[PDB]
């Protein structure tokens, strides 16, 4: 038999220094870390869509009841949960006429129609932000359903509906968030179906996105996103040792320029003088030529890690003692040597490779349930498996639908303690601010870095992008 | 359509579903043959849906 070790489930911090294994339950009982007096909300979209948003905001004002509270906690109400006033009165509304939103939609060229559709919203958003006295913390963009059907790649308009830029990505959300970066406007898009879905009907008569049993978690994951984008601290980690920067490298393809050019994006996570946590991005996108290199050249690698060591230095004072660069791609010696030189002598430089490709599936002997979340099969001092997705008793179920797939965590470069590395990535799986779930299947560095990469590679004209996640997720 | 006591080929409306596996040899952890499980469908039990 092969030994299979289990790591303690990481705990996250809430108000008053109280710690709780779960995020929803910790928020519901203890409340956010910081005091956010109120969320001045700006809404943009069609007048037919403003009523639905107002209805949903009033709906989440009252508590929401889900099918089974044991499987997933209910939502006690926004102002009770977050101690933050978010009313449907005081929203700054910008109207999008149906004729204007339909003129651009029915175009033969996907790139042109997406560019015009994004421009129609962003121009009004910039005008409201720059030439209006009202203050808006965050901007909700409610879009109709037909656009989503015909605003993403490979969307073929019906021949009957066609009535009549190439440097911009054909994705509505990506281009939308990309073109608003230079103005630093926190925006967060809603679809009409994500709204009061009960209006949208299928052929049978059931809602397409029937959320009847799962309204509570919907409110949970919308309220937390609104709170984060408005400038709140939902929760934080408490087990992260002092002096550890993490950084997560993700490589993304850019199709606009000839050859993908493989833009790379990074995110940092560390501590602060005291107990504060710092989780921002490190957006200096370092393009990598060649079609499929995914290995960063020495000059860009040195620039990246030099920026990372500085961005730690000005905010803490001294250099990190051990940086754990997680990366979905394997490190070759070329970039590692470049990393080493800019790295000082005291810093322990560690390069960790994480992968889901390895086909390992532990099936329990008896029972219709998956393995417990947190099991770690350590192959050797440098390589191991960790089940980030699995059964955890508090959620009463497993985070997967079928049997989950582990994360193949190997210390590619440096030495590192395998148990300590496995004890930290599992903690990184809990700081997902875009969604208030029990934990994420992959570490948030490898996920938020991929998000900012997908956003930064939608527009060619990005210059000095913001390093805050509010403008990206 | 069932080995041992356990069914492998079943019916679902007009689609006959079949359990299938894919194998791949790997030596890095140990001398191992990895197996992945998949489900396929046919319209008449012999020709796969294209």
């Amino acid at each position: 038999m092969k030994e299979l070790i289990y790591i303690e489930e990481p705990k996250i911090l809430f108000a008053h220094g109280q710690k709780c294994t779960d995020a929803r339950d910790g928020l519901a009982l203890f409340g956010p870390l910081n005091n956010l007096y109120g969320i001045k909300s700006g809404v943009i979209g069609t007048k037919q869509g403003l009523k639905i948003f107002r209805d949903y905001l009033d709906h989440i004002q009252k508590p929401i009841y889900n099918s089974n509270s044991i499987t997933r906690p209910m939502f006690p109400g926004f102002e009770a949960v977050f101690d933050c006033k978010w009313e449907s009165t005081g929203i700054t509304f910008k109207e999008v006429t149906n004729e204007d939103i339909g003129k651009f939609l029915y175009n033969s060229s996907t790139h042109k129609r997406t560019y015009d559709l994004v421009s129609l919203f962003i121009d009004k958003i910039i005008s409201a932000n720059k030439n209006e006295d009202e203050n808006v913390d965050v901007w909700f963009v409610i879009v109709p359903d037909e656009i989503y059907k015909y605003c993403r790649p490979n969307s073929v308009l019906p021949k009957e509906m066609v009535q009549t830029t190439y440097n911009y990505d054909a994705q509505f959300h990506d281009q939308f968030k990309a073109r608003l970066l230079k103005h630093t406007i926190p925006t967060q898009i809603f679809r009409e179906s994500t709204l009061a879905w009960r209006d949208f009907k299928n052929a049978f008569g059931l809602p397409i996105r029937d959320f009847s049993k799962i309204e509570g978690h919907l409110a949970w994951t919308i309220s937390t996103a609104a709170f984060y984008k408005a400038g709140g601290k939902p929760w934080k980690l408490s087990d992260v040792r002092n002096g550890v920067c993490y950084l997560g490298l993700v490589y993304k393809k850019v199709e606009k320029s000839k050859n993908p050019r493989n833009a790379c994006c990074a995110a940092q996570m560390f501590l602060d003088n005291g107990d504060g946590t710092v989780f921002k991005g490190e957006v200096g996108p370092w393009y990598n030529p060649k079609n499929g290199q995914y290995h960063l050249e020495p000059k860009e690698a040195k620039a990246l890690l030099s920026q990372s060591l500085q961005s730690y230095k000005e905010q803490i004072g001294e250099y990190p003692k051990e940086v754990f660069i997680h990366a979905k791609t394997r490190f070759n010696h070329q970039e590692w040597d470049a990393f080493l030189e800019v790295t000082p002598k005291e810093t322990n430089l560690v390069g960790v490779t994480i992968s889901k490709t390895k086909p390992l599936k532990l099936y329990k002997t008896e029972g219709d349930y998956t393995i417990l979340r947190g099991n770690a099969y350590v192959v050797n001092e440098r390589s191991a498996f960790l089940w980030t997705v699995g059964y955890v008793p508090k959620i009463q179920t497993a985070l997967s639908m079928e049997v989950p797939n582990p994360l193949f965590i190997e210390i590619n470069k440096g030495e590192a303690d395998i148990k300590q590395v496995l004890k930290d990535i599992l903690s990184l799986t809990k700081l997902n601010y875009n969604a208030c779930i029990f934990a994420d299947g992959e570490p948030v560095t490898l996920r938020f870095a991929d998000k900012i990469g997908e956003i930064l590679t939608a527009s060619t004209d990005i210059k000095t992008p913001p390093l805050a996640f509010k403008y990206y997720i | 359509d069932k080995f041992e006591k356990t069914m492998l080929v079943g019916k679902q409306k007009d689609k006959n579903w079949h359990f299938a596996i894919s194998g791949a040899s790997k030596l890095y952890p140990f001398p191992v043959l990895m197996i992945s499980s998949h489900i396929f469908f046919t319209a008449d039990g012999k020709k796969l849906i294209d």
Binding site: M1, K2, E3, L4, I5, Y6, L362, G367, Y369, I371, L372, G374, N375, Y377, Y391, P393 | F30, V32, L33
Partner: peptide, 16 residues
């Protein structure tokens, strides 16, 4: 090649 799958051993369990 063995027809019986490789078995590991977990020190932690749970119940419904």
């Amino acid at each position: 090649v063995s027809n019986e799958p490789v078995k590991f051993k977990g020190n932690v369990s749970y119940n419904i």
